[PDB]
Symmetry: D3
Subunit: 219 residues, 6 copies
């Protein structure tokens, strides 16, 4: 069961400390890049990616919650991103062009779905993704209500992968915590994006927090 | 001569270290909040403001380079901002309403002009500002070419202040470095927003960088 | 067979008269709120809702043909709306958040589909709706050509409701008149939004108009 | 001293009563048409204009607080508008084209300025206006704080008219009440747009309200 | 096997020569009209259509890659267009209205799909089209990578036509050349939009280029 | 008195003929590039520029009536443009950046004003322009009503040039014909953008048309 900590939930006072810990314990760094337009909020950016890059060996995954993802691919690559996760709802008319550009910069391809977006949205290019993520909360913030209905989407995603012989990892984004770990795994999740409720909140010291989370995942 | 370090230029690895140093040496924290729309880039956000707040006593100044500044006032106040610097080009039809909202949240008012925006743009509300800033570079990034033409704007701003009996501080944003300190002071600047070329670049250790900067300012 | 008069078609000269009559004869008040952007026209607003509220006991249903439905929920609740009908095409990325906000204001949830939008668009949240409406005319005005093709959508909506064990009412919007009553009922309609061609036109006096309509519905 | 009641502040329950009273006592009908985009609100529309037209002899003045005023000129003319008041901030690139279109439809031309817009904005076409209005409140709602700074704009407008030998009427929009009548007249106002605080609030019966207002104007 | 040359690929120096040749050899004139917004580029326009009209007898097909297709229908009819090809992704909320307007101007209806748009997008109005086109490349330019995945879309389109008893022609747009002719025909294509790689490149003289193309199609 | 023919008014049937004639008689090629957004129309594009380049020696001047001029500079240079004429109303926040980019591509700088835009809009960068153009008609089309008021703008532009010791050429765009030549020259024009009414209409053969125009200019 892979883990991808949501850096918009980290403690900058202990930046170096937390990044190094995460780099030797997690599988991915989940970096939210927002528009203020695609979603009503602003969080991280290429600058941030650039800073994390100084200490990272694990892949930096940039979730592009922006209106014009085309504007950030080259900039993110140069900042050190390893994964560019695209919203299907922002790439109609350019999905293949962007996926090719991402590959040209030697980065992996991620696809992330808003709660109300069906998996078929990606039918013509789902086979080009290394990882597909399911929002289990309407995008934009931390601490939003879990959307049970998304469990079916996770399952459909797993079934689709088997039936088509694909190898993408299935990620979950939004309220991944003790109250949902079980249902999510049963539904088909491979990766957990862990934020405030699943990791950082458990303890002020990240080592302790990680232990608590890991233990809760055990069930 | 007041100093306001541009945090989008800081080193996150030494976050705590640099914020505490800045808090006891500078006058303001310059926090750039971008849209990806008003300017073609993304940098800081309320999340960063919130983090800086944990260690700050000096005022946090949020430069709103966004299409809809109305969307960030309450959120920024809760994060700990003390100054909200508005772009006159984004508030036609709501300048007075926003200035009142900023005051209602007990924050000071800042006004910042793009290179091509004349000072008269603010004529009907210039007297409500605590600080007025002059972009000496087209907004969006660090390391852009200095715009000499802006010296006249600084002077006009000083003349306007005297002639009208106002008390706003005059700030400069963009390429404030050894090559411009003199001209800027002569023109009428009261505050220097110092970024990569004026501060951070001089040395890896911020103490050293600051004394180098302070020394250069002496001339 | 429930009736919901389209107030953008009423006679303001006899406002009080018509609202009171409608309140004691119809099941809902259909209030169109337009953007000039989501649809190329402008009709009613919160002001209008507020006025109708003074005399109403039956629920006020606000059809939100606007780009940013998020901007009107609290304001509409305050004006006295009882139903907020959302366009799935304007809530991708916020359907669950908005539905929760509507409930938080003690209002019922409505979902309305443009002619070219398939019912699956609502698959993940269709079960949260009290009423689902089918546009049988491209949105924006009164007196537009009926779209026969929408009969299949009504039927699919009815089948979906049975197969899933849901309880939402099925509403029709656009050219509900003598020429369509039969086909619409056969297709599965539960509510008729009646406008100029179905109600108001039949007679200058609303009592008479209602009589004529009621009689035509009989067949 | 001319009067133009703001219909978005009227009582629809007594629609006919109030329109007829206003038509025989006031000089203009002030009809606010909003976008939800140019200003964050929605109020009246062509539909309302059409209804008022049934009883009006005095000119209907449509204040276009919309992003694309071009979309409403023909429609408004058809509904019965006599005056189309344009926002200079929405017509750069089409002021002369629109003014010509308004004239072709035999309607008078109005120009309205947001608080932060200078009069020079209209310098090249100010001479084509029948009436020029000064917002004394940031546009969008009723009951907003009066902006004293606008008194200078009224004066400048009067001076400009004399110096250029023009004949436009000077209108005031926003918080025209007992507390401002005097200053406004001294500044140069010719027309008062009266809303909730200046008219409708004084009494539930409009005759009484008009009396109270008229009396307060006397001083 | 019908042919529709992409005029944005022609040689203006031999305008008259090439148009006349095309008019007596091809079946349609493919005229790309771009927004700079719906797709990141600008190519042809009504002006261009108007010029081609002077010499054409074969139908002019205008591919509307624009945000607001509603703005060009009357103008294009006026310029001499015979076919208006709409993008389903730009007509939600107005497909039926626009199709009716196109017919009212005596023009035929075309429907064109972006690579990532499924055929069901047109399910409610597919029967109103004279021709349906499949983009085999993300829209905007010439010389883009062919998208094999689109072969399934062509096939689905053919199957749909048979199963529903429709008569629309199936067109292909994007990299129609020697390397794809076979697969495209096998998939179900009826019309080939030929551009630089399929026609114009083969020879400087268009007669020669056309023979080479025709020969390659033979296989 | 320099001449710049508006190519959106030429005859494509005689493309080569007309371009060669223009190249040996005029001073500039005026190429209108529209957005469908900045102005409500579409005309020429980089493709067109590219074609004209094959035969031109005189400078190609690209008038950028687009929302995002930044998107076309490199592409236009590549196509062979020699002049890029920017609208001040589309470059607030990037005027200096774009002017530098234009110079970097070895192209000259043009500045064009909409009728309602004052010359001061360019005050901080007017000295960087090689040519400044005054729209004497609201942008978008050919054959629009001349705007006499623009004569003052031409004069102001001439006075400004003398008073500041600048060397920019003053161009006129919109209805430059027999009825305006005199007034325009008296006002201060150096270059005439000639379109349908001033050139092309006079005769089907361009030699004849040019002769007639030249003669009319004599007065
Ligand atoms: O729900 P939680 O435990 O507070 O976790 C918060 C994270 O899900 C959240 O920050 C996520 O990365 C964002 O992409 C959501 O827009
Ligand atoms: O020009 P420098 O020395 O690299 O400094 C960089 C700073 O001026 C810059 O980050 C500034 O805060 C931003 O508001 C500019 O959009
Ligand atoms: O078609 P009719 O009889 O004129 O009725 C008109 C009504 O359908 C119409 O006003 C409806 O409420 C609107 O939501 C349509 O955009
Ligand atoms: O300020 P008062 O007395 O409540 O009056 C309200 C009116 O000024 C107001 O409705 C006005 O017509 C609108 O154009 C303002 O956006
Ligand atoms: O790919 P080719 O052989 O260069 O052909 C180019 C044509 O496909 C292309 O111009 C097409 O008409 C456009 O609609 C694509 O946006
Ligand atoms: O007014 P005329 O004689 O028809 O000339 C037409 C030209 O002015 C016109 O095409 C011009 O180039 C465009 O930039 C206007 O938007
Ligand atoms: Mg995320
Ligand atoms: Mg700044
Ligand atoms: Mg409705
Ligand atoms: Mg008003
Ligand atoms: Mg095409
Ligand atoms: Mg031009």
């Amino acid at each position: 069961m892979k883990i991808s900590p949501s850096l918009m939930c980290m403690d900058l006072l202990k930046f170096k400390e937390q990044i190094e810990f995460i780099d030797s314990h997690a599988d991915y760094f989940h970096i939210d890049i927002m528009d203020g337009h695609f979603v009503p909020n602003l969080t991280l950016s290429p600058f941030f990616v650039s800073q994390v890059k100084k200490l990272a060996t694990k892949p930096l995954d940039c979730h592009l919650m922006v209106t014009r993802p085309q504007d950030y691919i080259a900039q993110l690559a140069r900042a050190g991103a390893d994964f560019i996760t695209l919203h299907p709802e922002t790439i109609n008319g350019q999905a293949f062009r962007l996926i090719d550009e991402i590959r040209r910069h030697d980065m992996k391809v991620g696809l992330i779905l808003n709660p109300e977006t069906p998996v078929e949205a990606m039918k013509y290019y789902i086979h080009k993704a290394d990882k597909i993520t399911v929002m289990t909360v309407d995008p934009g913030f931390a601490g939003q209500p879990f959307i049970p209905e998304m469990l079916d989407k996770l399952a459909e995603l797993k079934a689709w992968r088997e039936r088509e012989g694909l190898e993408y990892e299935i990620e979950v984004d939004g309220s991944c915590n003790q109250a949902t770990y079980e249902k999510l795994m049963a539904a088909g999740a491979d990766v957990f994006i862990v934020g405030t409720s699943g990791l950082f909140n458990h303890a002020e010291n990240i080592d302790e927090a990680w232990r608590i989370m890991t233990a809760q995942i055990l069930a």
